[model samples]
Target: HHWGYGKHNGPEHWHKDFPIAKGERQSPVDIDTHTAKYDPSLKPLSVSYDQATSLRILNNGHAFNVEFDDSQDKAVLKGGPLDGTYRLIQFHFHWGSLDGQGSEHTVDKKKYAAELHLVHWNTKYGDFGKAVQQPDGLAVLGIFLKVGSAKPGLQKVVDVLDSIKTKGKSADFTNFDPRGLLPESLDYWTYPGSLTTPPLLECVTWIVLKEPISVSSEQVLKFRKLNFNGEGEPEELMVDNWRPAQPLKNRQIKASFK
Candidate 1:
């Protein structure tokens, strides 16, 4: 099955191929503030990033992902809910072709224009290939992209959307730090959930920020300009790549700030 954001291969049908899609710890859950417990014990997120390590961004058909060089411990994510160091491998975005509600994770019932995911894997599990399958192998920080004022740091990314406008297209993008993409408040909700894409592996410790960073309306429209078509394929617009919020089941959500 060619998994994608369509009626046939969308998140609704992902359970057929990846049983974890229906698992108890699925991701992109609707966060209800009333139910979340404030965990005073939660440590502050210790994120140290290297802009030079920031590589390029690409459109992989499913979504636009920014690749990073994680060979050295130059960029890392620690503290918060993680036990040890997690290497920053890459980051990506999910957005709707047309702006309305495109965010993967929702706060209460508010939906943002888009969502950005900074993906990291535990250093203890060797490399990202093997670590991506383990229980505590991955840590993804999800930041909501609200429609408002332009984000200069994000504009560094949005400005290059035309380069990788089609599937497999990519270009060099540096001097852009993933940390700048985050909201001032690191206050977030933490839980164990699966990656929202193919294979749908249950390896992520999701950290969803409470405050959303601003991106211009033009920026959201710019995101839709990306095409999913490969060479010789029909021009297909890329939009609504987000997976719907799944059931939380018995899992608990822990908040870092009150």
Candidate 2:
């Protein structure tokens, strides 16, 4: 099936998540500024929110993957982001141990409180599967989540977290634009990368925002209460679901509007 744990059933065990995921373009690495070079042209394009995007909640029993219906105009990017018209596919999160430290991608080896990935694909290149093969076919917007006072930007999403409180239960969310969750500034850092998971494909354009969104202690606790192993059985609470950092392999990272 599309779900399970361990080396066989676990996401770290399966390749079905992204059939095209293969090679050296995978992501989820510690960003070491001293070791890497910087480029100005390699920047993230500005995204404009015009239409309302639709969110589909999938009850995977591990973590909720909220898929977005961007076929509508609610989500659009200006300055020709990437190589074509990219549509929002899904958005998910990554967390750390109980203490809230240690994530895959870090700034100068320093881990963040949490991480969120907003996966999108270019329609002009090909379908999700096909587009994933092109170097610039995919765009992943990354946002860091820090523990602190409740962030107004996250209220739109936190408001719906309660609807899917139980495992294997999901609800449809509409009239919500994914962009509403983004930080006030559109500025971001860009780089060439791939899926952070195995079978890593080198075909993603990463847009990591410098600014982070905030979450209250209660909100973080709610996420920590999730059962990442699946439904039923003793709840193996999901404390830290983040992967360790990977090597940069001589990749260049650049920031926009810096």
Candidate 3:
């Protein structure tokens, strides 16, 4: 069966095809804030995104992805537990049908309305395809979204959802600065983990922010309007695209702040 967030083919059944779905250091572990070690040595995250690199937004049947040009390092993520510079490739979100529970990574078992992932690839490998298979190949910055006042930064993204309503649909979305979507605080928890989706490669170094950004309930509803089906198929809402938190195993989560 094709991998999707459905009863028969959801996360629980992923291991049948991608055995590494159950591998050590799987992504999106429950963040037990009390047990996370505060590492004073960790530096603040460095994010420099060139708005011109923004290309387009696509609804790839699973989630919406806003791709960026990575032929050069104009937009990059560095510091905060990372050894070298990483180039921004794309960003996407995981959401639930309802506003109360959607985030992929939870804190103290608390869920958020949604989660944003800014994916970057290690520059040392020179190519994303090669980098994804390496242990230190990818770095994902996770930001939680809570239901609150309308966020101006997020409004830009929501405004375009109407154009990409169906699966495999895409629209040119340029000149959008991703930095504006970030919360004021850069404090985060770092851990070794895999991609939350299929293939489930254990290559990403996860950097999950402690501070959550705001998004109105109305904006969240806009995301639900996106369809999981293509133009001709029976329409289904694209909701609950998040994978549940995986087990932590022996991995320790290090916090950038106390």
Candidate 4:
């Protein structure tokens, strides 16, 4: 894959360049409840995100992303597998054409409607661009989306789709908090894996939450309407951007709750 989610140049052929495509401990693993090892010692995740730092939202020809100002430690992630504070940088999502086959990761062979990724970078790494490609450089908080009642917390985000319906367009997204967008449980499954995109850096310490919060069918359908095509291009829906689960190899999954 040279650079993207197009069928001819997407995931299935990523091995053409990135050798780590075959790396062990790869993620989006199908999390079978029967095999996970519960570690009572895993610390509770500590997150402190200032709403003021929530800056702008844009579509980068890939996924729609909401970026935060990481110049200061105004927003940080601690505990739960992180050695130091990791700055909250951006958040994005992946989905399929329909609700049933959308998510990148699943449980008991069950797929969710979609998946959200809160991307962060380790503070010890100096800067985000450099940190993303290093081991222990990134911590991605993954939350699955299931169809049910509408999620009030996320409605604030959905209301802005009109402004950024086209790729390369951006809009102001401030005073919005991500804390309200989570399930009550802090329990999760953690593992080492690569970013699910080309230039696939094996830098992410993946923290996938166990319980999925409700997202209306309508909300996820909005994501499907997003065009992955950039300026001066024919329109295409941005659905099914998820990468398939890679081989687990000898990797072990750790859990924070029983």
How does each model score on TM-score? Answer: 0.96, 0.82, 0.98, 0.94
lDDT of each: 0.87, 0.67, 0.93, 0.83
Tens-digit lDDT track for model 1 on 161-239? Answer: 8888788988897766877787888888999999999788889999988989999988788888788777568877888
Over 12-40, each residue of candidate 3 has an lDDT whose tens digit, in order, gives 99999999998989988999999999999
Clashing pairs in 3: none
Could you give the candidate ranking by TM-score, starting with the highest? 3, 1, 4, 2
Off by over 4 Å in 3: 50-52
- How well does candidate 4 match the true structure in TM-score terms? 0.94
List clash counts for every candidate, in order: 3, 7, 0, 1
Task: Say which prediction, candidate 2 or candidate 3, comes out ahead on lDDT.
Answer: 3
lDDT value, candidate 1, whole model: 0.87
Q: Of the pair 1 and 2, which is ahead by lDDT?
A: 1
Q: List pairs with backbone clashes in candidate 2.
A: 5-10, 21-199, 25-194, 25-202, 27-194, 51-74, 96-240
Write out the backbone clash pairs for model 1.
96-240, 97-239, 97-240
Best by lDDT: 3
Residues 21-50 of candidate 2: C-alpha lDDT, one tens digit per residue: 333545776766554444466434667655
Rank the models by lDDT, top first.
3, 1, 4, 2
